[PDB]
Amino acid sequence: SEAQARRAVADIFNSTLASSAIGAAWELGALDELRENGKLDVSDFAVRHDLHEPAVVGMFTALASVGIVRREGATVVVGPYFDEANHHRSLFHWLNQGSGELFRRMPQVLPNENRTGKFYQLDAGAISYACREISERYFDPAFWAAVDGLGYTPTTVADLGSGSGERLIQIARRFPGVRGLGVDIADGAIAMAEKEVAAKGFGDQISFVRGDARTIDQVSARGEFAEVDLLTCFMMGHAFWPRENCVQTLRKLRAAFPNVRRFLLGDATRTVGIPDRELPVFTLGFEFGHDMMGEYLPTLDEWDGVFEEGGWRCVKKHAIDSLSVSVVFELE
Amino acid sequence: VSEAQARRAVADIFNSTLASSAIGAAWELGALDELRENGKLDVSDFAVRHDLHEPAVVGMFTALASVGIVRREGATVVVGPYFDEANHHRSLFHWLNQGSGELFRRMPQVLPNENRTGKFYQLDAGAISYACREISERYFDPAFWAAVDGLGYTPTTVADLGSGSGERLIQIARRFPGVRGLGVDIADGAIAMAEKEVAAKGFGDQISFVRGDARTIDQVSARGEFAEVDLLTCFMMGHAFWPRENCVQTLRKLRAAFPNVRRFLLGDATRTVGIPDRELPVFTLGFEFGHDMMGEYLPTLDEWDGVFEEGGWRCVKKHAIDSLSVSVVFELE
Ligand SMILES: Nc1ncnc2c1ncn2[C@@H]1O[C@H](CSCC[C@H](N)C(=O)O)[C@@H](O)[C@H]1O
Ligand SMILES: Nc1ncnc2c1ncn2[C@@H]1O[C@H](CSCC[C@H](N)C(=O)O)[C@@H](O)[C@H]1O
Ligand SMILES: CO[C@H](c1ccccc1)[C@@H](O)C(=O)O
Ligand SMILES: CO[C@H](c1ccccc1)[C@@H](O)C(=O)O
Ligand SMILES: O=C(O)[C@H](O)Cc1ccccc1
Ligand SMILES: O=C(O)[C@H](O)Cc1ccccc1
Ligand SMILES: [Ca+2]
Ligand SMILES: [Ca+2]
Ligand SMILES: [Ca+2]
Ligand SMILES: [Ca+2]
Ligand SMILES: [Ca+2]
Ligand SMILES: [Ca+2]
Ligand SMILES: [Ca+2]
Ligand SMILES: [Ca+2]
Ligand SMILES: [Ca+2]
Ligand SMILES: [Ca+2]
Ligand SMILES: [Ca+2]
Ligand SMILES: [Ca+2]
Ligand SMILES: [Ca+2]
Ligand SMILES: [Fe+3]
Ligand SMILES: [Fe+3]
């Protein structure tokens, strides 16, 4: 019926604003205040954060329009979808603040004749902001379980796609005296990581080399790769694909880190068979986004079927809770 | 709610985001019109006919299907339960996403007072103008033509404030042959697009344009071309006259600059009041929230009703619009 359609299309429209507002409300500290108190005063919030109050009210209204919060007079209170939306806030942030410009330019990204050079734009800083919580909230538990199951004590750990350096710092805290080596293709991430590690007191223990993990055989790192006995690779593995490339990169890693015992590999994957109206959070954005960008994304089964050919054996596998289909593999 | 209902609602909000952006893109790329014709289409065929990247096309339609706009059936896409409603409002999705999406995306940077100076947000002007073209025809035409049909006289020269594409002047010239048209628009861009289009349609004799700011019309030196005007029109920009004190003066100045205008047809969307948060209809939230983000005044319907007399005008008829939020056409004289 018409009334139902009217309401469903309106919710579609409003969900757009609520979606953008989830990431924004995280970044600006509102979701944390509402989690800690169950409520807040909108004027007081606007004043304590020095925000444009009409826009703040707009922000909470968007959230309220689809049931994440409820507005009661001067006040905003948690609504029925608050816990679920707050749980997944970093994915909304990734979708909007990080990737929004990609999805927005859909009419300009889809034509074949535009798809050369730098045909889309991501907000790298925003993506990094979101990936920090995505790594801790969804991957940390399986990561540390894999670490707890190593069967040895690492002495030098190399992290591929090292980013901010956080993972290497956490391993260094777990295992006093371990040395770390982070490889990242982006000179900007090398510089940020170097700064963080120095600031946190791990400058003499953790180093960084700029390098492409897909051509790890070309990376010059003072002969340190041969000392590495734990290898880690989180949220970037899909970059090794398509399959023939992935097989060669896996062999190359096997030869460049010949004293690696365990290789812990964590990523999100492309799903198969999920009915359109049942797609869970993230899955559609991650896949559609990689398809817009022209980047390969393997399924779980494709990973499972590549290891042996690539020179590794999967000895344990961990399911991630609610990040589309995501896994951590323990390879040796 | 159970945890499962919450899971579903939040996944829906997430997927809505992609569907929303896809409605606009599907319009712009020709998909929604192909589906209207036949009720179905072949995804690969579409992709090949439009030379588009097929995996991305497949995601576009999957996003649409994710919330019930379309339904995917093997290789085909078929219209879904919300197709007609979404298609009806497609220009509003485009406006929200392809036009205004960068505004909303930058919420965390736009809200802090310290950032709100200079150029602190970015709209896609060309996308907005593409959507506004259809918004104008789809939402404002019935009431605009209703007002035109009760003028009680035959205009001889019409001036349109915020003329844009020139399309309203051209439509008036097709209904009133040998009416003359004058458009006033602040953008050099709009002026040149409109001149071109007028020429192309064979009207460059009847219709002319002048760059000018309708907020300060006394500073536009249009040559008592303004004195021959007996019909004044202004659609989709009136809220630029506000705040109230500026609105009063702008109104008086238009009255003076167009002393021979009989009727002044003023159409715009307005800020609503009192709508419950879970009942907000399409457009309302994005129009209002966006203007509050840009720091741009938006009056309510009551504010407009209370300003005309001070501004030198009498409101003789008002038309409600279906429903672009709360929109109206006022007939002033
Ligand atoms: N082919 C490649 N080789 C090395 N680093 C890469 C790469 N592809 C992407 N990266 C880096 O991988 C990072 C992905 S962000 C995820 C970071 C980190 N592994 C974590 O769990 O938090 C970015 O710094 C990017 O620069
Ligand atoms: N203060 C002002 N003076 C003159 N033109 C203005 C203006 N503020 C906005 N505009 C113009 O008004 C147009 C808004 S789009 C509306 C176009 C037209 N009235 C229609 O119904 O389709 C743009 O071309 C913009 O350049
Ligand atoms: C930058 O990290 C992001 C991510 C998020 C979840 C899982 C995997 C990767 C994503 O932009 C990517 O690298 O594909
Ligand atoms: C540019 O057109 C847009 C519009 C849409 C509906 C009604 C009025 C105006 C709007 O973004 C504007 O305020 O100028
Ligand atoms: O094939 C798989 O499932 C995984 O890649 C790893 C695995 C295989 C066998 C037993 C445990 C784990
Ligand atoms: O005050 C109002 O409602 C309108 O501005 C115009 C109107 C007034 C009186 C009779 C009809 C129309
Ligand atoms: Ca309170
Ligand atoms: Ca509610
Ligand atoms: Ca675009
Ligand atoms: Ca779900
Ligand atoms: Ca398997
Ligand atoms: Ca077909
Ligand atoms: Ca359906
Ligand atoms: Ca299918
Ligand atoms: Ca931002
Ligand atoms: Ca800007
Ligand atoms: Ca823009
Ligand atoms: Ca001027
Ligand atoms: Ca409605
Ligand atoms: Fe990726
Ligand atoms: Fe406006």
Q: DSSP for B104-132?
A: HHTHHHHSBGGG-SSS-----HHHHHHHH
Cβ–ligand 6 distance for B315 under 6 Å, the answer: yes
Ligand 9 mean position, distance from CA A103 (Å): 9
- Helix/strand/coil (H/E/C) assignment for every residue in A97-146: HHCHHHHHCHHHHCEHHHCCCCCCCCCHHHHHHHHHHHHHHHHHHHHHHH
Q: B69: which residues sit within 8 A by CB, 6+ positions away?
A: B19, B23, B80, B82, B83, B86
Distance CA A280, CA A274 (A): 9
Residue whose Cα lies nearest atom 4 of ligand 3: it is A235
Among A329, A182, A211, A310, smallest CA distance to A255 is for: A310
Q: Nearest CA to CA, how far is B1 from chain A (Å)? A: 7
Among A243, A96, A232, smallest CA distance to A170 is for: A232
Distance CA B95, CA B280 (A): 17
SS3 B155: coil
The one-letter code for the residue type at B159 is: A
Nearest ligand 4 atom to alpha carbon B296: 13
Beta bridge partners of A70: A77
Cβ–ligand 2 distance for B257 under 6 Å, the answer: no
Residue among A49, A61, A106 whose CB faces B25 most closely: A106
Distances (CA, A) of B197 to A256, B144, B188: 65, 21, 14
Distances (CA, A) of B51 to A5, A156, B36: 32, 50, 21
Helices B188-200 and B167-175, packing angle to 10 deg: 30
SS3 B74: coil
| Token representation of residue B184 | 């006033």
Distance CA B298, CA A176 (A): 60
Distance CA A188, CA A198 (A): 16
SS3 A33: helix
| Token representation of residue A241 | 């694909």
Spell out the alpha helix ranges (H) of chain A: 2-27, 30-37, 42-48, 53-65, 82-87, 89-93, 100-104, 106-109, 124-134, 140-148, 166-174, 187-199, 243-256, 283-293, 300-304, 307-310
**Experimental method, per PDB record:** X-ray
Which domains are delineated in chain B? Answer: 1-100 (1.10.10.10), 101-333 (no CATH)
Q: B310: which residues sit within 8 A by CB, 6+ positions away?
A: B248, B251
Distance CA A247, CA A208 (A): 25
* Sign for the pseudo-dihedral over CA of B320, B176, B128, A120: positive
The one-letter code for the residue type at B25 is: A
Cβ–ligand 3 distance for A91 under 6 Å, the answer: no
Distances (CA, A) of A16 to A76, B14, B18, B66: 20, 8, 8, 14
Distance CA A145, CA B101 (A): 41
The one-letter code for the residue type at B239 is: H
Distance CA A161, CA A184 (A): 5
| Token representation of residue A249 | 């990169």
**In this structure, what DSSP letter does residue A241 have?**
-
Cβ atoms B20, B96 nearer than 8 A: yes
Among B128, B121, B39, smallest CA distance to B84 is for: B39
In this structure, the strands spanning A179-184 and A206-210 are parallel
Distance CA A193, CA A197 (A): 6
- The separation between the first and the last C-alpha atoms of chain A, rounded to the nearest angstrom, is 58
Cβ atoms A166, A190 nearer than 8 A: no
Distance CA B154, CA B151 (A): 7
Cβ atoms B326, B270 nearer than 8 A: yes
Distance CA A253, CA B272 (A): 61
Distance CA B18, CA A285 (A): 7
Distance CA A98, CA A121 (A): 9
Cβ atoms A182, A193 nearer than 8 A: yes
* Sign for the pseudo-dihedral over CA of B155, B157, B161, B165: positive
Distances (CA, A) of A169 to A96, A307, B180, B203: 29, 28, 74, 71
* Sign for the pseudo-dihedral over CA of A143, A149, A155, A157: negative
Among B299, B331, B333, smallest CA distance to B318 is for: B331
In a 10 Å sphere around its CB, with 0-12 CB exposed, 13-18 middle and 19+ buried, how is residue B142 labelled? middle
Residue among B50, B116, B281 whose CB faces A10 most closely: B281
Interface check A23 vs B, CB under 8 A: yes
Ligand 4 mean position, distance from CA B132 (Å): 7
Distance CA B67, CA B60 (A): 12
Complete edge-to-edge strand list for the sheet that includes strand A206-210: A206-210, A179-184, A156-160, A230-234, A262-269, A325-331, A314-319
Among A99, A107, A110, A68, smallest CA distance to A285 is for: A99
Complete edge-to-edge strand list for the sheet that includes strand B326-332: B207-211, B180-185, B157-161, B231-235, B263-270, B326-332, B315-320
Which residue bears the tokens 């790594």? Answer: A135
Beta bridge partners of A326: A268
CA angle B163, B165, B169 (to 5 degrees): 55
Task: Return the H-helix or E-strand segment holding A29.
Answer: none
| Token representation of residue B200 | 């192309």
Ligand 11 mean position, distance from CA A320 (Å): 16
Among A330, A215, A197, smallest CA distance to A266 is for: A330
Cβ atoms A184, A232 nearer than 8 A: no
Cβ atoms B136, B170 nearer than 8 A: no
Interface test with A, best of B102, B107, B124, B278 (most A CBs within 10 A): B107
SS3 B263: strand
Task: Give the phi and the psi of residue A158 in degrees, each rounded to 5.
Answer: -110, 130
**In this structure, what DSSP letter does residue B206 have?**
T
Interface check B286 vs A, CB under 8 A: yes
Distance CA B298, CA A53 (A): 15
Beta bridge partners of A316: A330
Task: Return the H-helix or E-strand segment holding B158.
Answer: strand B157-161
**In this structure, what DSSP letter does residue A261 have?**
-
Distance CA B291, CA B299 (A): 11
Q: Alpha carbon B178 to chain centroid distance?
A: 28
Cβ atoms A116, A108 nearer than 8 A: no
How many CB atoms neighbour CB A38 within 10 A? 10
Among A291, A244, A300, smallest CA distance to A268 is for: A300
| Token representation of residue B175 | 């209904």
Cβ–ligand 3 distance for A130 under 6 Å, the answer: no
Cβ atoms A209, A220 nearer than 8 A: yes
